[PDB]
From a paper:
We obtained two crystal forms of YfiB (residues 34–168, lacking the signal peptide from residues 1–26 and periplasmic residues 27–33), crystal forms I and II, belonging to space groups P21 and P41, respectively. The crystal structure of YfiB monomer consists of a five-stranded β-sheet (β1-2-5-3-4) flanked by five α-helices (α1–5) on one side. Here, we refer to the two dimeric types as “head to head” and “back to back” according to the interacting mode, with the total buried surface areas being 316.8 Å2 and 554.3 Å2, respectively. The “head to head” dimer exhibits a clamp shape. The dimerization occurs mainly via hydrophobic interactions formed by A37 and I40 on the α1 helices, L50 on the β1 strands, and W55 on the β2 strands of both molecules, making a hydrophobic interacting core. The dimeric interaction is mainly hydrophilic, occurring among the main-chain and side-chain atoms of N68, L69, D70 and R71 on the α2-α3 loops and R116 and S120 on the α4 helices of both molecules, resulting in a complex hydrogen bond network. The apo YfiB structure constructed beginning at residue 34 has a compact conformation of approximately 45 Å in length. Thus, YfiB alone represents an inactive form that may only partially insert into the PG matrix.
The YfiBNR system contains three protein members and modulates intracellular c-di-GMP levels in response to signals received in the periplasm. YfiN is repressed by specific interaction between its periplasmic PAS domain and the periplasmic protein YfiR. YfiB is an OmpA/Pal-like outer-membrane lipoprotein that can activate YfiN by sequestering YfiR in an unknown manner. Previous studies suggested that in response to cell stress, YfiB in the outer membrane sequesters the periplasmic protein YfiR, releasing its inhibition of YfiN on the inner membrane and thus inducing the diguanylate cyclase activity of YfiN to allow c-di-GMP production.
Residue numbers in the entry:
A (entry chain B), B (entry chain A): 34 to 168
Write the structure that this text describes.
Amino acid sequence: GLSAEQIAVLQEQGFELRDEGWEFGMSSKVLFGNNLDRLNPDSRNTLTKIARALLAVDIDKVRLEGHTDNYGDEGYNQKLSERRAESVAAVFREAGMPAANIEVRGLGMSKPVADNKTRAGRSENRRVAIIVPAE
Amino acid sequence: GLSAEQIAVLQEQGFELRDEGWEFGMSSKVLFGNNLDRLNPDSRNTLTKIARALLAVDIDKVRLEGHTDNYGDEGYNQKLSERRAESVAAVFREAGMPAANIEVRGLGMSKPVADNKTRAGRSENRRVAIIVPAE
């Protein structure tokens, strides 16, 4: 049961509603640049800001999901996606979100959002979803 | 898109976000009893309240979609399902939603949410759905 005031904050922070709840997806290019799992300093501050905004209205559970394109080793992409999700998780922990309320998954190339047949598609598949689970 | 106060009312009213938008399904047995497209008075009562709740927060455009199971003449089931969706549009007009803002479709047997092999599945397929369009 999310209040209208909580929904307002999620909307202002850029979340959109999906099957699993309120989701804010950011591409890996925005989040990490040419880094591996170290966030761009700017992206990290941005994420700390989102985290504090949710917590201010007692939104204090998040699920963090990492994705890669299909290009490359499945196993490597899998670990990378997970480490990338964990980088975002750590920002939410330091921002004051309980470790038990934070869930981190690496989904590798399993859950595309765009077509791996094009270089532009693949780029969109490399991403981390911030989800606030709600039914 | 919809506001936080609107989303909250939809959720309260039992609507769920689906791929075509916010959807609230009602079984044809509850709506029509043994009638054809005549609503039974209790269901009329129930529908007026939903309309008013939506109307109270400027949700004044809906799509109403009637469905049947796969039993019987397909041509007849289309017509029955459209007529049933129309009975619901009339309640919504009378509650004050502009006629031009109501979209009626009879989908007959073509959009099942369950399996028609069993009586249980067939009864769930027999429904009218209220849709508030969305992103």
